[PDB]
Amino acid sequence: NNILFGLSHEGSHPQTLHAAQSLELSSFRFTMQSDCNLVLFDSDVRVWASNTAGATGCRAVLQSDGLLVILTAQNTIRWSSGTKGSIGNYVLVLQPDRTVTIYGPGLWDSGTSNKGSVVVANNGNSILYSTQGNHPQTLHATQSLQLSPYRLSMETDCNLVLFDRDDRVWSTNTAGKGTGCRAVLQPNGRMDVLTNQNIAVWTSGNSRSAGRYVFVLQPDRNLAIYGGALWTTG
Amino acid sequence: NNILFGLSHEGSHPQTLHAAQSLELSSFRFTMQSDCNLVLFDSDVRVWASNTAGATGCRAVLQSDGLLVILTAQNTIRWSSGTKGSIGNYVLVLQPDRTVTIYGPGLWDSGTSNKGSVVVANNGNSILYSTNDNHPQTLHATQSLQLSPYRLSMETDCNLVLFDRDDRVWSTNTAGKGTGCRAVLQPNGRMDVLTNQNIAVWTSGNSRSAGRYVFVLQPDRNLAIYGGALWTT
Amino acid sequence: NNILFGLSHEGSHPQTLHAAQSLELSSFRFTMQSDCNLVLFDSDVRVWASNTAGATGCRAVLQSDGLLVILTAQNTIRWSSGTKGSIGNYVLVLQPDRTVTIYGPGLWDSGTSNNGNSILYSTNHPQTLHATQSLQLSPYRLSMETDCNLVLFDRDDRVWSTNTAGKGTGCRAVLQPNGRMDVLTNQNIAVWTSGNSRSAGRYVFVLQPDRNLAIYGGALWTT
Amino acid sequence: NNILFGLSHEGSHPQTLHAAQSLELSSFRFTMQSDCNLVLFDSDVRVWASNTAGATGCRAVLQSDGLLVILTAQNTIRWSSGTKGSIGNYVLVLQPDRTVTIYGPGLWDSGTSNGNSILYSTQNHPQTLHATQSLQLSPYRLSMETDCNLVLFDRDDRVWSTNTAGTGCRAVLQPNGRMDVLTNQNIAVWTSGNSRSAGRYVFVLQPDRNLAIYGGALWTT
Amino acid sequence: NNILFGLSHEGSHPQTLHAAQSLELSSFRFTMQSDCNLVLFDSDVRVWASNTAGATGCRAVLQSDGLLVILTAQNTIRWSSGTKGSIGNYVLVLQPDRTVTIYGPGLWDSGTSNKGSVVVANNGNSILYSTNHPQTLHATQSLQLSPYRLSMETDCNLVLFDRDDRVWSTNTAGKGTGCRAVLQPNGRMDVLTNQNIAVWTSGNSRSAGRYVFVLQPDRNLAIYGGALWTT
Amino acid sequence: NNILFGLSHEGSHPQTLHAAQSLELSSFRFTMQSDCNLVLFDSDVRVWASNTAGATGCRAVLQSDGLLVILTAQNTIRWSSGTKGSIGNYVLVLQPDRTVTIYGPGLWDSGGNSILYSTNHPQTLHATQSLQLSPYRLSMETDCNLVLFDRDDRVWSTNTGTGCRAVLQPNGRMDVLTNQNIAVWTSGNSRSAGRYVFVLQPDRNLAIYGGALWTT
């Protein structure tokens, strides 16, 4: 995918970038090379890099506090990004904007992880904050969010439905509360499914500090909001 | 799917809606039913219909001069639509604002079609012009239009590309001439692929009287754009 | 190969079914059996028979006025379809919906003589033919070309046609509920047509083992 | 099914291949073509064929002395297989080894009047019969008891048996012509009764309710 | 595989060698040739042979008291091995030892058989007795035909598997841990603890010689009993 | 299994590969054949062998000081790997990547089952994670303990909290690393830096071989 998960937890994977492991998004790649040097290329073009090279078997990993150590085999911290934030769990993502950014702690989840199948044979999967940096910055009806069996989508009933392989596994349970809805994700990480005449009928309800947050459909069937832009590149 | 292709060609099908065969967008559904009535429905809620009932084997079909006609069992018209156009190719689409509509003649195709697999085990593949709440109205970086092996993407290199399964089939070859592109289709059906910086690196060129056009990632692996817009409930 | 041509004589084989002998639409087998049972499978999972089990060297034959009969090692008739109608040429057909059934009179045809094959009608399908679009027997095929001309070819060459052409990009051929074969147009206009017809009813076009087209009509019985 | 009969009197069908018609072993195809080609396909992809596409209104038809003949609207052959031998009863079978062949003579029945051959001791197969081990055609079937017997059944009832009834026997059919009821250490417990010149022999269960040994060999491809 | 079956029944076959039919162990192929000669080869090398040549439509076939014939065309016996034992079932195996060797009658069977998908692809399915190997199995150490395979475990149980659910077993856990199963040179399976005690046994036994134990294609676990004839 | 054990004598079978006998990792197969060669099969495609085809009675056997030697009916050496290290116990392994190989020495012993190390995986274990042998398994529980048990009855733990994992060090040390990167437990021995393996033995054992010796 494009996203890396936290050293927690139950099941979204990568938990790590091992050695010529990359994150890919149409031309973004952020691979963790051979020689220990963590680097983000746009087609052929060095744009980012801990210049930490000259070494081996290093591994990319991101921490519960936010951190992005680069460990060394003997588990010695070649590099770190040193920002650091509260406990909870984080996600790092490569973004249409050409950057990589961790976001955390989290802020709300659906409670629909499920363990098994759980693929990625390519893409399509976060909704961006109302950032204006890089999108989806939303969902309209007949608009989607998808990992694999799994998908999240905006009804025409006005309902956000999550389906597992054709069968409805979690919904907003709006569904004729409205008409043009879209759901939106507030600069606060509140997910809101609002109407045609601008009205919440469904809300995620728990907001934080306005800054940029990120809604994810995780490899487990989990939907979670991750609420932090703690550190980034350009 | 939710288009209907009308009587000419490239075996992009439907080319007919028979007898108890609907067109479906989430929950909406405009179905050629069971007693010649040609109706739209949201779930149970009934929204438009031709009120042409009680008879048999009326099938629904589209024409070449834009009419949508319910044809009879023995070739007789139960009902027309009334408006007519020019010569072509028209789609008949059922849209996210709940409506049904015509575009036609068409107006630019890619040229890249394929009699072969032509798929769908659900969904969705048009882009919408600019205006109601009928979208895609822009495609973004990482954003698409998908039929089935077939897909359209807007990449980070600033280049609109066509997979056929995982492979490069048509493409704009505008890679790196921009960092933040999008592909929007204009008010006089003119696709453009514009940069960061509202500068268009590529255009479809051909256009018409403004209105409201549509572009369809065909089932023949065709890209193609249609406009007039000729009729809706 | 799924039509049984009843009797009437010109080249159209099957005219009977014999006993370890059947008609086949994959899944859908129709067999005439070693015990006097005339039987319809779906995969295997028997769906209708004549239940005539209890005889030997029994055949299936379809009549001439279109009654299908099943007749004993002695010519006497253990099961008969029943209905039966005026008199020359008909078809018992095994349809892709599983109805097992019967069309006739002969009613219209080329005049040109010596799997792929039927076009179903306006009710089951093909219910139309189209341009690249075709019906095939073996060297035979009845196609509607894009000059918008209906031709018959026999080992690629042109034995019977419409003779319509230039005239078209529009066209498709559908066969009516009264029996007209109509070569229709981009917009709904008649371009050519068979001529003649009979009653409202289901109808079939069949390309036959005789270089031919027979539309067979009204309909006379079903399962 | 996959064999064709002699123009026999006995009824036992097919006796002609016609026009849209074919005998199929499942993978392979033998059909009448309508241009006159009698052709053998594998799937699609032809393997052989008379090279006759070019006359009339044709049909495929086997003779009284195992001659394949295919022949016109006008009754004249267009191509004829060869070798004509005896003059009784033959079979033109298209086998599991893709060889199309004609057996010929007649040579023992049972007299009692898919699945059905048991090939010989030659090269193609069942080549023998063993206990819930049988050959069947339609309510008919010629099974091999555990109990050592050789019945025939027509529907759950015994139309012919070997009177033989032992513990590990299989029938196997000789290469001169007799079925055989062999056994265990290798005794005989039964034999068909006779035989004939040495060669590929076959043994169909048949629409007629009887076993019947063609016992041939007279042409192939 | 590498074994042939005595023509007495029930499931499992080869009941015969046919005519460009062989039995293979990596290298070794004991094939029934094309012109009646039965032959064994290691590579291209005529190791052994009936050298019955010139006829046609033989068949190799093995008898209920192990005679091994090369039968005819027409059921005439071109060549038999020679010896004859007693009655029951019987197996021809081609071995590491570079040998066809027949053993039988049997002497113990599990009593698991089972008609259905009777399998193979390749190999490695029988255990040799003592001087030619697995003359022993270990724990993590196994024997396996196909969708079935039996094997030694550490709770010291001997266990048989149809695809990943145990059908037979020695019903021995925590009775030791040394644990290996082995065929005695008298045809007794002994599953013995680390202290060479036996916790489970096979019962019968007879005659010392060379025996064999076989995971059949029919879920049987059987042990043939004689050691009548080799090349 | 597809690890072969040194002669070293202890309850860990294979101590030899015999002749219709072999090793296998679902596709991989490497056998001793009846032709004196020891071959490497990927499905069908012979991928690597000793080409010692023509000698007899042969065995694969792995050397007490880590050579692997292929022997005659007649104790004779048709191939040696070549390299050999110091002495007790090694392991030869046909590893998740189709590289055949050697690891030795023993280094710590608790007193699809392997856990590569650092470059092939598992390269690690979490709670829920497990290496399994057969009466037996090593798991990493989210208590953040590390037991071994035979039949869910417990033989050894570290007696260690919550999203710790377990890992094998850049030379030799087993690790109970602490969601944040801390050592909630640790083996205690270092040894050259090199590629290592940990192996749930067939003796209720677990042992880590290291420094690291021939390869294909």
Residues 201-220 of E with CB under 8 A from F: none
Interchain proximity F135–E153, CB inside 8 Å: yes
Dihedral angle of Cα B85, B86, B87, B93, to the nearest 10 degrees: -50
Interchain proximity E139–F1, CB inside 8 Å: no
Interchain proximity F169–A72, CB inside 8 Å: no
Domain at A1-104+228-234, CATH homologous superfamily: Bulb-type lectin domain (2.90.10.10)
Q: How far apart are CA C176 and CA C182, in angstroms?
A: 8
Closest-CA distance, E103 to chain F, in angstroms, reads 20
Q: How far apart are CA C79 and CA C74, in angstroms?
A: 13
Closest-CA distance, D196 to chain E, in angstroms, reads 12
Domain at D1-104+216-221, CATH homologous superfamily: Bulb-type lectin domain (2.90.10.10)
Interchain proximity C188–B57, CB inside 8 Å: no
Residue of chain B whose alpha carbon sits nearest to that of A45: B176
H helix runs in D12-56, sequence order: none
Q: How far is CA A128 from CA A145, B194, E58, in A?
A: 12, 21, 78
Q: Confirm if D70 and D100 have CB atoms less than 8 A apart.
A: no
Chain gaps in chain D, named by the residue before each (C–N > 2.5 Å): 113, 123, 165
Sheet holding F22-25, edge to edge: F22-25, F28-32, F38-42, F46-49
CATH 3.40.50.300 holds for E1-104+226-231: no
B96 closest CB neighbour out of A98, A124, A142: A142
Q: How far is CA C93 from CA C5, C11, C24, C179, in A?
A: 9, 17, 10, 17
Domain at F1-104+211-216, CATH homologous superfamily: Bulb-type lectin domain (2.90.10.10)
C-alpha C38 chain-centroid distance: 20
Burial of A28 (0-12, 13-18, 19+ CB in 10 A): buried
- State the amino acid at position C191 in one-letter form: V
Interchain proximity B73–C131, CB inside 8 Å: no
Q: What angle do CA F141, F212, A77 make, to 5 degrees?
A: 55
Q: Confirm if F34 and F54 have CB atoms less than 8 A apart.
A: no
Domain at B1-104+228-233, CATH homologous superfamily: Bulb-type lectin domain (2.90.10.10)
Q: Confirm if F40 and F51 have CB atoms less than 8 A apart.
A: no
Q: Confirm if F92 and F4 have CB atoms less than 8 A apart.
A: yes
- The closest alpha carbon to C181, from C162, C194, C165, C197, belongs to C194
CATH 2.90.10.10 holds for A105-227: yes
Q: How far is CA C166 from CA B61, B89, C147, C149, C181, in A?
A: 24, 19, 5, 8, 19
Q: Please, which residues have CB within 8 angstroms of residue F190's CB and are 6 or more apart in sequence? A: F169, F171, F172, F173
Q: Confirm if D134 and D143 have CB atoms less than 8 A apart.
A: yes
* CATH topology agreement for domains C1-104+218-223 and C105-217: yes
Q: How far apart are CA F65 and CA F89, in angstroms?
A: 7
Q: How far apart are CA F124 and CA F111, in angstroms?
A: 22
Interchain proximity A142–B133, CB inside 8 Å: no
Q: How far apart are CA B109 and CA B107, in angstroms?
A: 7
Phi and psi torsions of F192, nearest 5°: -50, 175
- The closest alpha carbon to F39, from F25, F28, F50, belongs to F50
Quick check: do B and C touch, 3+ CB pairs under 8 A? yes
Q: How far apart are CA D47 and CA F142, in angstroms?
A: 66
C-alpha A199 chain-centroid distance: 27
Q: Does E59 touch chain D (CB under 8 A)?
A: yes
Closest-CA distance, B156 to chain A, in angstroms, reads 6
Q: Which two tokens stand for residue C139?
A: 């060297």
Cβ–Cβ contacts within 10 Å for residue E29, how many?
16
Q: Confirm if E169 and E159 have CB atoms less than 8 A apart.
A: yes
Q: Please, which residues have CB within 8 angstroms of residue B200's CB and are 6 or more apart in sequence? A: B192, B193, B194
Q: Which two tokens stand for residue B179?
A: 């960092």
Q: Which two tokens stand for residue B140?
A: 């973004």
Whose structure tokens read 């409670």?
A: A111
Closest-CA distance, A123 to chain B, in angstroms, reads 9
Q: How far apart are CA C23 and CA C26, in angstroms?
A: 9
Q: Which two tokens stand for residue A97?
A: 């904007």
Q: How far is CA E65 from CA D143, E39, E88, E106, in A?
A: 26, 22, 7, 11
Interchain proximity A27–B155, CB inside 8 Å: yes
Residue F202 is given by DSSP the state: T
Chains that touch A (3 or more CB pairs under 8 A): B, F
**Residues facing C159 on adjacent strands:** none
Cβ–Cβ contacts within 10 Å for residue A104, how many?
26
Closest-CA distance, A56 to chain B, in angstroms, reads 31
D122 closest CB neighbour out of E9, E57, E63: E57
- State the amino acid at position A24 in one-letter form: E
Mutate to test the interface with F, among E1, E2, E26, E131 (most CBs of F within 10 A): E26
- State the amino acid at position A206 in one-letter form: N
Label each residue of chain C as H, E or C.
CCEEEECCCCCCCCCCCCCCCEEEECCEEEEECCCCCEEEECCCCEEECCCCCCCCCCECCECCCCCEEEECCCCCEEEECCCCCCCCCEEEEECCCCCEEEECCCEECCCCCCCCCEECCCCCCCCEECCCCCCECCCEEEECCCCCCCEEEECCCEEEECCCCCCCCCCEEECCCCCCCEEECCCCCEEEECCCCCCCCCCEEEECCCCCEEEECCCCEEC
Q: Which two tokens stand for residue D73?
A: 């609207």
Sheet holding B106-109, edge to edge: B106-109, B223-226, B214-217, B126-127
Q: Confirm if A183 and A174 have CB atoms less than 8 A apart.
A: no
> Strand runs (DSSP E) across F10-56, as ranges?
22-25, 28-32, 38-42, 46-49
- State the amino acid at position A153 in one-letter form: S
Q: Does E19 touch chain D (CB under 8 A)?
A: yes
Residues 73-102 of E with CB under 8 A from D: 73-75
D176 closest CB neighbour out of E59, E64, E74: E74
Q: How far is CA A161 from CA A151, A183, B106, E134, in A?
A: 8, 11, 35, 59
Pairs of residues, one from chain D and one from chain E, whose beta carbons lie less than 8 Å apart: 35
Q: Does F181 touch chain A (CB under 8 A)?
A: yes
F134 closest CB neighbour out of E124, E153, E178: E153
Domain at D105-215, CATH homologous superfamily: Bulb-type lectin domain (2.90.10.10)
**Fold of the domain built from segment(s) C105-217:** Agglutinin, subunit A (2.90.10)
C13 closest CB neighbour out of D1, D19, D53: D19
- State the amino acid at position E38 in one-letter form: L
Interchain proximity E73–D175, CB inside 8 Å: yes
Interchain proximity D172–E69, CB inside 8 Å: no
Q: How far apart are CA C9 and CA C57, in angstroms?
A: 23
Helix (H, G, I), strand (E, B) or coil at E213: strand
- State the amino acid at position C8 in one-letter form: S
Q: Does F11 touch chain E (CB under 8 A)?
A: yes
Expressed in angstroms, the distance from the first to the final Cα of chain B is 19
Residue B95 is given by DSSP the state: -
- The closest alpha carbon to D33, from A230, E152, A54, C138, belongs to C138
Q: Does D127 touch chain E (CB under 8 A)?
A: yes
Preceding omega of A187 cis (within 30 degrees of 0): no
Q: How far apart are CA E69 and CA E82, in angstroms?
A: 9
Interchain proximity D121–E57, CB inside 8 Å: yes
Q: How far is CA A89 from CA A14, F127, F162, in A?
A: 14, 16, 13
- The closest alpha carbon to B226, from B24, B29, B86, belongs to B86
Q: How far apart are CA A185 and CA B73, in angstroms?
A: 52
Q: How far apart are CA F84 and CA F104, in angstroms?
A: 9
Interchain proximity D18–C138, CB inside 8 Å: no
Consecutive H or E run containing D28: strand D28-32
Quick check: do D and B touch, 3+ CB pairs under 8 A? no
Closest-CA distance, E100 to chain D, in angstroms, reads 20
Q: Please, which residues have CB within 8 angstroms of residue E50's CB and are 6 or more apart in sequence? A: E36, E37, E38, E39, E70, E78, E79
Q: Confirm if A185 and A193 have CB atoms less than 8 A apart.
A: no
D13 closest CB neighbour out of C21, C33, C139: C21
Q: Confirm if F215 and F24 have CB atoms less than 8 A apart.
A: no
Interchain proximity F163–A63, CB inside 8 Å: no
- Highest CATH level, class, for C1-104+218-223: mainly beta
**Fold of the domain built from segment(s) E105-225:** Agglutinin, subunit A (2.90.10)
Which chain D residues are within 8 Å of C35, Cβ to Cβ? 138-139, 154-155
Q: Which two tokens stand for residue E166?
A: 């145990």
C-alpha B27 chain-centroid distance: 18
Residue F71 is given by DSSP the state: B
Cβ–Cβ contacts within 10 Å for residue B63, how many?
25
Which chain C residues are within 8 Å of D91, Cβ to Cβ? none
Burial of B44 (0-12, 13-18, 19+ CB in 10 A): exposed
Residue of chain C whose alpha carbon sits nearest to that of D208: C57
Q: How far apart are CA B42 and CA F135, in angstroms?
A: 60
Q: Please, which residues have CB within 8 angstroms of residue C60's CB and are 6 or more apart in sequence? A: C4, C16, C17, C18, C32, C38, C68, C69, C70
Residue of chain F whose alpha carbon sits nearest to that of E2: F20
Q: Which two tokens stand for residue C103?
A: 């069309």
Whose structure tokens read 């927690």?
A: A8
Closest-CA distance, E173 to chain F, in angstroms, reads 9
Helix (H, G, I), strand (E, B) or coil at A152: strand
Interchain proximity F18–E134, CB inside 8 Å: yes
Please list, residue by residue across B64-74, b when 16 or more beta carbons sit within 10 angstroms of its beta carbon and e when fewer do: bbbbbbbbbbe
A71 closest CB neighbour out of F123, F179, F181: F181
Dihedral angle of Cα C90, C96, C99, C101, to the nearest 10 degrees: 0
Chains that touch E (3 or more CB pairs under 8 A): D, F
Residue B196 is given by DSSP the state: T
Quick check: do D and C touch, 3+ CB pairs under 8 A? yes
Q: Please, which residues have CB within 8 angstroms of residue F48's CB and are 6 or more apart in sequence? A: F39, F40, F100, F216
Q: Does E135 touch chain F (CB under 8 A)?
A: no
Residue C178 is given by DSSP the state: S
Cβ–Cβ contacts within 10 Å for residue F207, how many?
21
Interchain proximity E26–F20, CB inside 8 Å: yes
Residue C211 is given by DSSP the state: S
Cβ–Cβ contacts within 10 Å for residue A35, how many?
13
Q: How far apart are CA D123 and CA D97, in angstroms?
A: 9
Q: How far apart are CA F40 and CA C169, in angstroms?
A: 63
F34 closest CB neighbour out of E27, E134, E140: E27
What is the residue extent of each domain of chain C? Answer: 1-104+218-223, 105-217
Residue D136 is given by DSSP the state: B
Give the resolution value in Å.
3.3
- Highest CATH level, class, for F105-210: mainly beta
Pairs of residues, one from chain B and one from chain C, whose beta carbons lie less than 8 Å apart: 47
Interchain proximity D175–E8, CB inside 8 Å: no
Q: What angle do CA B3, B4, B5 make, to 5 degrees?
A: 115
